[model samples]
Target chain A: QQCNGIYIWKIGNFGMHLKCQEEEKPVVIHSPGFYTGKPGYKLCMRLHLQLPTAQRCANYISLFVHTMQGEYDSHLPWPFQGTIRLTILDQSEAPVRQNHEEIMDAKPELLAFQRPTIPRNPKGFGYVTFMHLEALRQRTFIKDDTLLVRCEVST
Target chain B: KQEPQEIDF
Candidate 1:
């Protein structure tokens, strides 16, 4: 089936850090199956997330649309232009009201922020940039060691 | 291959 370049991802285990990251660099979250690895974009329209430790006041988690580069350039594009929405599902409730944020008609220059610290890959990574973590942990998000991170990218 | 998304109720 053709994706029509519309990719929606519902990722679990998004915030399982032994600890977490600080303001400068965030601790990455990777869902083994979603191809959802830390901090950047990857092939197959991959998605990933990040959460800064409980130091900063805002203390938000993050979402990314990595850079899609290399051999797949022709098939994909350099700074994937799309409308991306990142969500955090509040599993504790019914009707599943989720708290989500988005970027409209995202461009390349803006995507340059918060890169994958590990190394570079063909699929570049970028994010929703704000989903304060501790605040959620204190009030809503976490439940019995599982998290719900969702993203929908429209190209 | 899908579990979370595919629920049986």
Candidate 2:
């Protein structure tokens, strides 16, 4: 038997989806969901990337989301929708890169999220962040970049 | 600089 991957459902119901793309260089992370709904029942998407570099290494990170109309938008709350944490680990599973850790440890102010902007299609928006790492090790790498780590709620 | 730090998310 063959398998087809498509599901249909009614609007107003909640659903979640995730995907990942790998590249030698880092790509800007973006939130690809609408924030239109009851404060308690909002729908959003998050992107998390792990690099095989030291936790203290500094680098440039940028995040932006495109609306359904194909327009770039920024301005989301800090740790907005919970802190989107990015970590780097060594081959032996040691911590190498961490954004929040540095922010708390007092090494330096690494990155910050943009402010919220005009509301469009509550379901069509995004967010992003950029940072630098200390060093890169062969064993250190991202474990699950091509899969959805978590979703708000399942339908 | 070579200390191992375990970061929890």
Candidate 3:
């Protein structure tokens, strides 16, 4: 309804949401009826607790998928076979916790979408290196320090 | 006479 699953972050020098929403600055994938499909498309992520890989971000958490290479297929197509659901919202216990079958130990042959013609480009097709700075001090999964990444995209 | 342990400071 708003900016669905806000994207990107690379703390080598501060980062968050730069390219997407049909770029050329032609729009935004910021959760608003992504490809005209009314749903939550939610995005609430604020990660940074000051510790480990915050610079190079080797702790990795960049689950990516950016569409629109043109020809305006009107709605979802061309290398677009989406399936991304990352819920590490930390419910103080486990209201939710998921990698949804986390995979990508160096491209286990690309999980959710392995080339329909490469729409998962430039940024990174997929990555959620699980984030483990000792599980980010384990506040029932990063509660106070902030790491509520709730994103869902199904195509 | 091994009792020289009585000194107060």
Candidate 4:
């Protein structure tokens, strides 16, 4: 978890994810479980390639950070107060200029940052319109049918 | 007076 205070999640077969989005399927993908820090909280990121038209993030990609039940849950603090930064990597020769970034402050009021009662907390806090699906395709965020996303959690 | 504002699409 302390590896760099950052956790990177890569989505493979990004084209497949896009196909599912175009077909109007209720498809959601999740990142592998990871710890925020060596002695920190456990969690994972959930991604939606395309949100429904009725939602605020309609026609856009969404990302959320969910709290998970970690082996050290009981020993950690409740209502995580850390800051989170989500970045959509650009796979071009010049990646930084086209990259998308979102910074989120922890919301203690939501059950998302609280201790998990289930395997994973259903409630989560993140960006609704993280990025538009069209914007994604127009850019070099995808390479070799894969998409890269990074999560930075400062606990 | 007018000010400029920028937003990402």
TM-score leader? 4
Residue A56: error of model 2 in Å? 17
Number of clashes in every candidate structure?
A: 18, 18, 7, 0
TM-score of 4: 0.86
Error of 3 at A97 (Å): 13
Listed in order, each prediction's TM-score against the native is 0.51, 0.25, 0.27, 0.86
lDDT of each: 0.43, 0.26, 0.34, 0.77
Which docking class does model 1 fall in?
incorrect
Candidate 2 segments whose C-alpha is farther than 4 A from its true place: A1-27, A33-59, A62-101, A104-117, A120-134, A144-155, B1-9
What C-alpha lDDT, on a 0 to 100 scale, does residue A144 get in candidate 1?
59
Candidate 3 vs candidate 4, TM-score winner: 4
TM-score of chain B of each: 0.46, 0.39, 0.28, 0.50
RMSD of each: 10.5, 14.2, 23.9, 6.0
Which is the better candidate, 1 or 4, if ranked by TM-score?
4
Q: Candidate 3: lDDT of A61?
A: 38
Global CA lDDT of candidate 2, please?
Answer: 0.26
Q: Rank the candidates by DockQ, best first.
A: 2, 4, 1, 3
Better of 1 and 2 by TM-score: 1
Identify the candidate with maximal DockQ: 2
lDDT string for model 4 (A43-153, tens) is 888887664553655788778888889988878888788788889998888634678888777877767778877888777777767878888767788888888999998
Superposed model 1: Cα runs more than 4 Å off: A1-26, A30-58, A68-72, A77-79, A109-129, A138-140, B1-9
Candidate that beats the other on DockQ, 1 or 2, i.e. the better one: 2
Lowest-sum lDDT 10-residue window in model 1 chain A = A31-40
